[PDB]
Design an enzyme around this catalytic site. Sequence first.
Site, mmCIF file in Angstrom:
data_model
loop_
_atom_site.group_PDB
_atom_site.id
_atom_site.type_symbol
_atom_site.label_atom_id
_atom_site.label_comp_id
_atom_site.label_asym_id
_atom_site.label_seq_id
_atom_site.Cartn_x
_atom_site.Cartn_y
_atom_site.Cartn_z
ATOM 1 N N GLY A 27 0.777 -1.207 0.000
ATOM 2 C CA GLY A 27 0.000 0.000 0.000
ATOM 3 C C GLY A 27 0.819 1.272 0.000
ATOM 4 O O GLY A 27 0.344 2.283 -0.358
ATOM 5 N N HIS A 28 2.011 1.189 0.517
ATOM 6 C CA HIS A 28 2.931 2.261 0.498
ATOM 7 C C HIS A 28 3.898 2.208 -0.646
ATOM 8 O O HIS A 28 4.334 3.193 -1.095
ATOM 9 C CB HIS A 28 3.655 2.335 1.835
ATOM 10 C CG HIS A 28 2.726 2.424 2.986
ATOM 11 N ND1 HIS A 28 2.737 1.535 4.024
ATOM 12 C CD2 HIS A 28 1.678 3.228 3.203
ATOM 13 C CE1 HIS A 28 1.774 1.820 4.859
ATOM 14 N NE2 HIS A 28 1.120 2.844 4.383
ATOM 15 N N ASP A 31 9.073 8.542 2.165
ATOM 16 C CA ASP A 31 8.079 8.006 3.079
ATOM 17 C C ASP A 31 8.188 8.728 4.417
ATOM 18 O O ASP A 31 9.278 9.110 4.865
ATOM 19 C CB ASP A 31 8.286 6.494 3.262
ATOM 20 C CG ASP A 31 7.128 5.809 3.991
ATOM 21 O OD1 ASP A 31 7.076 5.871 5.234
ATOM 22 O OD2 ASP A 31 6.265 5.206 3.309
ATOM 23 N N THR A 42 0.852 8.654 1.959
ATOM 24 C CA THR A 42 0.128 7.760 1.072
ATOM 25 C C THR A 42 -1.355 7.677 1.399
ATOM 26 O O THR A 42 -2.063 6.858 0.803
ATOM 27 C CB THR A 42 0.748 6.352 1.093
ATOM 28 O OG1 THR A 42 0.676 5.802 2.416
ATOM 29 C CG2 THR A 42 2.213 6.406 0.641
ATOM 30 N N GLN A 83 -5.853 -3.909 -11.476
ATOM 31 C CA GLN A 83 -7.028 -3.197 -10.973
ATOM 32 C C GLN A 83 -7.358 -1.962 -11.808
ATOM 33 O O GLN A 83 -8.537 -1.631 -11.988
ATOM 34 C CB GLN A 83 -6.827 -2.820 -9.505
ATOM 35 C CG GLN A 83 -7.891 -1.882 -8.943
ATOM 36 C CD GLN A 83 -7.858 -1.803 -7.417
ATOM 37 O OE1 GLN A 83 -7.548 -0.746 -6.836
ATOM 38 N NE2 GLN A 83 -8.153 -2.917 -6.763
ATOM 39 N N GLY A 103 -7.652 1.342 10.369
ATOM 40 C CA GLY A 103 -6.677 2.359 10.026
ATOM 41 C C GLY A 103 -7.358 3.594 9.469
ATOM 42 O O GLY A 103 -8.318 4.132 10.036
#
Length: 436
Positions: free
Chosen positions: A14-15, A112, A133, A322, A360
């Site tokens: 995801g990151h 990050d 993100t 996707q 989250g």
Amino acid sequence: DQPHVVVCSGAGMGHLTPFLNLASALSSAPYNCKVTLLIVIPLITDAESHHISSFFSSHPTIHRLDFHVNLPAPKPNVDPFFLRYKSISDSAHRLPVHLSALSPPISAVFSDFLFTQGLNTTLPHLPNYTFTTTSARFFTLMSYVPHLAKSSSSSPVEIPGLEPFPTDNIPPPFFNPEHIFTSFTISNAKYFSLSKGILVNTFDSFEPETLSALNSGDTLSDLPPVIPIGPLNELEHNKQEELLPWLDQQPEKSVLYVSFGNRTAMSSDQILELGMGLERSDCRFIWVVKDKDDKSELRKLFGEELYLKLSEKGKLVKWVNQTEILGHTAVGGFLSHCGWNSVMEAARRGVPILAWPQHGDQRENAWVVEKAGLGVWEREWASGIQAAIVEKVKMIMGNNDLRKSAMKVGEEAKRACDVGGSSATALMNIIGSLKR
């Protein structure tokens, strides 16, 4: 002549995904930078390793920089990814020797948020753009985590200038400064003020109240400018998606795409109720559930009758491309956990979202989706999975107001990353500032 920038990625798919998207965009026109992409090794999952390998194989012009951080030993009752995030955050102070040896001398780093404290203390004269993100909304809450505690685990959190955050949308660890996740969140958020900017994979018209409040000073925080640069262009993947011919045979906007992400923590009983619900809805679908061309786990899970009824109407698959699914005219809606990458890929294509957030940032993201008119958040989906899917699928696929508002989200998202768009202009201005 052209700048050399470093994209400093962390861990977890995801990151990694948005960071790979950023490095790809910056290495390409119209930005035309030299990009070094930093990877933290070892990687935690084979999925991560494969996607990184495919990325570099398809972007040979981007340089790979391996940053080795020893794996922490697992401990009972501690999430493995949090332990890895902590080890990365604790290593960030070691980056100077690695980034300084890069040639030509680098002009900026896009990092990050786990590298924030390390980069902004040990390399204070190098422009560091912290790239979050998640949504601007949830990012704001994360940056406030130092100022909680001081606590009250039990009251909505009121950041000045923004709608309050209800307790049920806040990860309970955030109220405990000694929780592993909170610890490195505080350590790095305390240094956000020295970043040159916060980059967000969002766009101005998607979160206008949050972005307006941030950049007018209303939140009273010490953040640098918060800069939407999204949505980021999806990666061209090699192999066109296999379900595209089947989608080509389905009526326009008739297919519900279902994917909860690699993260999803849904029990077999929940998967089974979802299958029962989709079957009684009789909608067409593509469902990423649970290596595999094995249906046996799916036949065991659903039993033989339900499995065959589902397979009559939709596809039960291990993985998809996707963005290729979401871009196809036959897809009419997106049932999702509302991770922020999925939200932004749906936004780019104007695909209505049915939001079943899990943990989250996902419940605040679902609220952002609902506020923007991109989708509907089923707040208590877990309390009645079958009824929730049967009732809302017809609305997702047939409500013209929601289809219309979602389509206008898609038009604004495309305009944001188009030439002259709000996001393309912001990222172009950043890259332009590096050219002396």
